[PDB]
Amino acid sequence: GLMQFTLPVRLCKEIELFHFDIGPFENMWPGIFVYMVHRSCGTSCFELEKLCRFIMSVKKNYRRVPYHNWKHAVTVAHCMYAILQNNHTLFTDLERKGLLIACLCHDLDHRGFSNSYLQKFDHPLAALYSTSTMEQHHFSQTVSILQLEGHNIFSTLSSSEYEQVLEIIRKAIIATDLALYFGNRKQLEEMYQTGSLNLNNQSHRDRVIGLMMTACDLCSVTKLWPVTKLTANDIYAEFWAEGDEMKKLGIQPIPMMDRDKKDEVPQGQLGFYNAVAIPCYTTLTQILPPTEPLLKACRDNLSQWEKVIRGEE
Ligand SMILES: O=C1NCCc2c1[nH]c1c(Cl)ccc(Cl)c21
Numbered sequence: 464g465l466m467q468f469t470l471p472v473r474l475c476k477e478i479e480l481f482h483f484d485i486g487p488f489e490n491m492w493p494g495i496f497v498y499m500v501h502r503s504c505g506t507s508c509f510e511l512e513k514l515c516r517f518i519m520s521v522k523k524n525y526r527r528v529p530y531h532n533w534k535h536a537v538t539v540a541h542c543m544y545a546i547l548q549n550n551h552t553l554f555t556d557l558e559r560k561g562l563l564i565a566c567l568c569h570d571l572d573h574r575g576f577s578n579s580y581l582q583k584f585d586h587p588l589a590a591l592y593s594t595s596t597m598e599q600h601h602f603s604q605t606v607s608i609l610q611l612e613g614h615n616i617f618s619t620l621s622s623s624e625y626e627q628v629l630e631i632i633r634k635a636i637i638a639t640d641l642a643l644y645f646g647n648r649k650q651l652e653e654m655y656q657t658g659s660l661n662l663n664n665q666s667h668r669d670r671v672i673g674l675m676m677t678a679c680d681l682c683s684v685t686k687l688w689p690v691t692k693l694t695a696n697d698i699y700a701e702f703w704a705e706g707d708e709m710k711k712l713g714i715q716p717i718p719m720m721d722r723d724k725k726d727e728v729p730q731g732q733l734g735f736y737n738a739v740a741i742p743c744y745t746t747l748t749q750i751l752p753p754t755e756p757l758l759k760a761c762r763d764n765l766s767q768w769e770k771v772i773r774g775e776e
């Protein structure tokens with residue numbers, strides 16, 4: 464009850480900032496996560512014994528892949544924490560509870576491969592879930608871990624609050640399917656500009672929480688350049704492995720994913736920043752003005768990728 468988590472002074476200050484890096488000490492990540500829940504939600508939101516049992520089961524079900532790993536899970540949860548803290552009054556108790564947990568669980572049991580590689584491989588998961596293949600699996604894994612004895616962190620909620628929170632988590636996890644992001648952002652763009660966007664409209668909330676999930680999921684492009692550059696390495700290690708496996712299926716991969724065409728990465732990064740990241744953080748800042756530091760940092764990093772192409776580094 465009276466057991467606060469505290470952080471060292473540097474972490475205590477820096478964790479409030481969008482561009483915080485959770486650092487290389489794995490064993491500190493669970494406490495960083497609990498710290499964020501206790502300040503986003505309250506020291507009352509979860510039975511600490513259950514939360515901790517939940518966190519360690521979630522951690523175990525992330526695999527040892529270069530990018531889609533436990534560190535990504537906590538990095539994306541930290542970004543959602545920063546958005547929630549900078550937008551205190553815009554979200555319900557249930558939404559704050561649900562979204563931090565959604566972020567932690569959003570890539571559960573990721574194998575390092577796209578929905579697209581699953582479909583071409585003819586993976587069992589692609590027969591069970593025709594679209595948002597991995598994202599329907601990640602939600603499935605979340606529910607499975609919630610149903611382990613001692614793991615139902617939501618136990619104290621009413622029957623209908625419970626159904627509300629699991630529906631907040633399903634929509635939020637599904638929304639991390641980047642194929643759904645494009646339409647979701649275009650719809651949010653029109654709604655903001657025609658002035659129809661209404662946060663009391665549940666279907667409008669859903670859209671806005673989806674964009675937040677995309678913004679947190681991509682938050683690697685909003686870090687200080689040295690963090691962004693080294694995380695890009697990790698994402699490309701997965702992309703190249705997947706490119707290799709495409710070749711093994713007798714399919715030339717897009718040059719982005721082909722490890723023989725590493726020279727083309729920077730232009731690929733430019734495209735991704737221009738087509739995905741900048742529009743994502745632009746639309747998010749229009750709707751949630753205090754999220755502007757994410758846009759600014761993303762623009763700084765776009766500028767850094769332009770220097771990479773030019774050969775200035
Ligand atoms: O720079 C990146 N950081 C993490 C996220 C990310 C980055 N580059 C990407 C490309 Cl080219 C495609 C799809 C994603 Cl999710 C990408």
Ligand SMILES: [Mg+2]
Pocket residue numbers: 569570597639640
């Ligand atoms: Mg994912």
Ligand SMILES: [Zn+2]
Pocket residue numbers: 535539569570639680
């Ligand atoms: Zn992710």
